[PDB]
């Protein structure tokens, strides 16, 4: 008859919530990250169909926390602009977006003060009949970004700790929700750029097959629709001004950087080819129509909200600014290049954190950024018109949706190497997932050997991960030891197989079924078997002592 046999290193897994670590004086690519692995091993799991859900992927929330945590830490040692909150006597420089302001500054010696001046943008100034104050003075103290930092969105690779694995959905037309017949396993993600933006997603990944439109629920007009493009659209933005910096000493080793202007003033703007955009829009509308088969499609401007939403926000590698994209989110489009006007802020409120504020220093000389539009965020108007037309608008604001637009292909699971199966006996990477239980047993070492040390503000995470990996490893080894199966990969025991545990044919089990399928059926009695196994060894130990005593 059949007996219990223990297998260690079987290719099965379950959804898990763990912590991933960062693989590369940048603001994001900090010194605490590890070197990347230049050769990812995309092992194809043929005959394995995993189900993904980008809308419940904890990786996104983890990413969000990571980005913020780093940001805050990076600006920790930077100058706090406390003494800046003084009476501002301002005049003019019709592009009157810049005001020349004078104020009283406290010198190195507390007993002494003097006059000083700086150029500020109207957007950063609040009327207090020509006296003003800095906008932040009634909310919090803005921290001046340290003069020697880099805000370039250097791509970050996420890697799993030993015992865990990252699955990829390689189905180029996957909607981000459902089965992925085309699935592979990797140790790390690719390099994803921490691009902070709204409306139009820049410098992201392009679709590999076609334009894909995905959402949590198209029937829910309170949710955002994410569209990923296959063909990129070039957009170039520039700030054609002599923003000469000035160094103002506001304390004992604390320098404030003020803006100055040498020449004249021209508004910043973006340049996007009309013909290009038009084509892209037409293509997107077509795909939308497929979901909304008997209606017209119209693109309009933002319904309203904070500047950060109504306009296109992005970091041009320098000073942050916002552009008016009403010329793009439209139905009437010209072939000629479209110029979009923009405005610049010195005082920036990151994300949606109240009380958080940073001040950006001026960059001497002009700036020009060449970037690609890779996708965008749209929302649909509620209700329905007799005109049988649906209206879509730009939106965003929650950076999690930006991260979600890149990490949607990844899923994190934990490997459960210990399995039990019925056999006819009595005692005395992960590619095998697609193989049958029998054949899969020939790769137990290949898998098991990589479940311990595969790894060889981020510091604490790496340390925690290391400990966890050890705990799990030892736990399993302890069990194998107790059951008298130490050092074995396939261990036949002295416990008989139950009839209530399975009614499957032995041949089907080993020749047809895979370990994943088996687990889902036999797991019902996991603890039952373990208990019996422990009792068996106890019996054996006393029997050995009995014999030894002779």
């Amino acid at each position, epitope marked *: 008859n059949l007996w219990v046999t223990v297998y260690y290193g079987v290719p099965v897994w379950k959804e898990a919530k763990t912590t991933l670590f960062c693989a590369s004086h940048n603001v994001w690519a900090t010194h605490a990250c590890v070197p990347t692995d230049p050769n990812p091993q995309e092992v194809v799991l043929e005959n394995v169909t995993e189900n993904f859900n980008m809308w419940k992927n904890d990786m996104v929330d983890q990413m969000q926390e990571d980005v913020i945590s780093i940001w805050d830490q990076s600006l920790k040692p930077c100058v706090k602009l406390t003494p800046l909150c003084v009476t501002l006597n301002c005049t003019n420089v019709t592009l009157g977006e810049i005001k020349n302001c004078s104020f009283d500054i406290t010198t190195e010696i507390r007993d002494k003060t003097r006059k000083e001046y700086a150029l500020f943008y109207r957007l950063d100034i609040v009327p207090l009949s020509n006296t003003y104050r800095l906008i932040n003075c009634n909310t919090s103290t803005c921290t001046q970004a340290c003069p020697k930092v880099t805000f370039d969105p250097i791509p970050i690779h996420y890697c799993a700790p030993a015992g865990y694995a990252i699955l990829k959905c390689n189905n180029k037309t996957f909607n981000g929700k459902g089965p992925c017949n085309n699935v592979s396993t990797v140790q790390c993600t690719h390099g994803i750029k921490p691009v902070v933006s709204t409306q139009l997603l820049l410098n992201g990944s392009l679709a590999e097959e076609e334009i894909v439109i995905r959402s949590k629920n198209l*029937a*829910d*007009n*309170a949710k955002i629709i994410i569209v990923q493009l296959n063909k990129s659209v070039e957009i170039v933005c520039t700030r054609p001004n002599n923003n000469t910096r000035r160094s103002i000493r506001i304390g004992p080793g604390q320098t404030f950087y003020a803006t100055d202007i040498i020449g004249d003033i021209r508004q910043a703007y973006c340049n996007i080819s009309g013909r290009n955009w038009s084509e892209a829009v037409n293509q997107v509308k077509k795909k939308l129509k497929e979901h909304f088969p008997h209606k017209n499609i119209s693109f309009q401007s933002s*319904s*309203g*909200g*904070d500047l*950060e*939403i109504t306009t296109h926000s992005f970091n041009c590698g320098g000073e942050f600014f916002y552009c008016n994209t009403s010329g793009l989110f439209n139905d009437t489009i010209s072939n000629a290049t479209i110029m979009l006007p923009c405005r610049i802020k010195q005082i920036i409120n990151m994300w*949606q954190e*109240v009380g958080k504020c940073i001040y950006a220093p001026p960059i001497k000389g002009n700036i020009t950024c060449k970037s690609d539009i890779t996708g965008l965020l749209l*929302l649909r*108007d*509620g*209700c*329905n*018109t007799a005109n049988n037309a649906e*209206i879509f608008r730009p*939106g965003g*604001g*929650d950076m999690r949706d930006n991260w979600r637009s890149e990490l949607y292909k990844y899923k994190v699971v934990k490997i459960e190497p210990l399995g039990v199966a019925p056999t006819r006996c009595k005692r005395r990477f992960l590619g095998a997932a697609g193989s049958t239980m029998g054949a899969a047993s020939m790769t137990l070492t290949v898998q098991a050997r990589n479940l311990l040390s595969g790894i060889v503000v981020w510091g604490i995470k790496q340390l925690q991960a290391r400990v966890l990996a050890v705990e799990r490893y030892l736990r399993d080894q302890q069990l194998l030891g107790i059951w008298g199966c130490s050092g074995k990969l396939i261990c036949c025991t002295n416990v008989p197989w139950n009839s209530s545990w399975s009614n499957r044919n032995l041949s089907e089990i080993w020749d047809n079924m895979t370990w994943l399928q088996w687990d889902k059926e036999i797991s019902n009695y996991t603890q039952i078997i373990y208990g019996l196994l422990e009792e068996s060894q106890n019996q054996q130990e006393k029997n050995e002592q009995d014999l030894l005593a002779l």
Partner: antibody
Amino acid sequence: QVQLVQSGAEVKKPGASVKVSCKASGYTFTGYYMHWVRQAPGQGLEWMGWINPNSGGTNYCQKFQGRVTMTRDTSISTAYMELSRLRSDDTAVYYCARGKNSDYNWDFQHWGQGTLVTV
Amino acid sequence: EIVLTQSPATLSLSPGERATLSCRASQSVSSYLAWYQQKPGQAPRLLIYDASNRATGIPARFSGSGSGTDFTLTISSLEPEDFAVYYCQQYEFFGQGTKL
């Protein structure tokens, strides 16, 4: 507990505009979307739109586009709605409402007293 | 779009009895439904959500079920206090409701 407190009833002349406030308490103001819906005087309810206090983002019912606008002030946990070009058919009780869960926010578990507006 | 229809428009019922209220839609919405109680001069109150779950403070005798495009609210042990208007809701779409 939580509650929504709306302004009192108001009477305007046709063509004019009305402003209706709604103060929230008992929870994080920016935790959930605020919805506006009006109850017609002897008929079913008609959804107006909603606002997201985190960014002031809005979504208006198509049929009122260009007539209604919404905003907010987080410092006083108060939402605001305004309707211009008022008509006689706009007479209704405008309710301030909040959903139960941040995930499915259409479950309007929490309601204000409603504000009656006429011409 | 989604158009919700309920019936019977009105129901003259007595205490202790049982009755149900239908709700239909032209499109499948799985189970994302809600039912609201409406009394004269009062604010709307959530009764049932997900077409299965009772709202806070709602007695067990209030239930309902449905799927896809055909849903129904069920109320047992009817009371005089139930003589109100009940609405069927899906997303921003409100039905006409019925009166007991």
